[PDB]
Amino acid sequence: SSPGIWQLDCTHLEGKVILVAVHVASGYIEAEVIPAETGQETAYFLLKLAGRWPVKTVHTDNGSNFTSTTVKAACWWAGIKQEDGIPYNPQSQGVIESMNKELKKIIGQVRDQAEHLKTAVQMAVFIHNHKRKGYSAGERIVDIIATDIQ
Amino acid sequence: SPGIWQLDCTHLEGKVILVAVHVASGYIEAEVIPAETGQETAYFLLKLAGRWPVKTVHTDNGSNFTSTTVKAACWWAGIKQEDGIPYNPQSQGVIESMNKELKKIIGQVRDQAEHLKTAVQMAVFIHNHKRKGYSAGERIVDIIATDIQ
């Protein structure tokens, strides 16, 4: 049930890991920088996400986060259906890859306004979510969920 | 009023919990930091503003209002930085009752979590999903969508 579906995505820059959750129907994202991608870091990220938006299903980014009993524990706690991220629609690989390339492009455009990577990544989240492609992803996600609530 | 948020800083376990409240819905975001600094408050506002359409923030005290780092983030993210004077004295009470509720919830989960930051995020989840009716998470999406339309 597609207002509530999100996809995890993990990409790397500067020897660090940027973990992203994408709301599939709108392309809105949340992201954070962590030193490496562990079940504990992924579980905490998902607890954060589910306290902020009505997360029904998460498609995990890889088999290690799908297997992780810590990740399964957070998804139980927060009431999320934990699913695999197999691109049964091959259009998903491309969408995620193009998203990672866009975010890295934005990060480079700001990277020198920020001493730390985490600031640049949050600046890139802001720019991505506010960009009008015309509605922005931040407007699409609120419209979609409000439509569902009503 | 869809874009109005209030900062609030409360303390537990020798640590600081920074909260932003969306005033019209009561929805909240929060984090644990070792102490309140302008840099920490500035980063939290940058995070908030990338996730919701933050027009105005009422700062939680005069040090965050003065901090040029906080002003720099509010410039970056397009937020009007305002004071947090409770011209409506009901604001004082609402924030204090909120902090007491969050600490209650934190105590109710605290033993499912090794670290305070997990407990605080469990409490954010319970607060935003609580039906008071509609929940604060429903109210904030309702209000912003209504404004967009």
């Binding site: 306004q113 920020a114 001493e115 730390h116 600031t119 600046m123 | 840099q39 500035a42 980063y43 940058l46 040029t68 780092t69 720099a72 983030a73 970056w76």
Partner: peptide, 8 residues
């Protein structure tokens, strides 16, 4: 440092 996150 002339950075948004480190104005020094």
């Amino acid at each position: 440092d002339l950075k948004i996150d480190n104005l020094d």
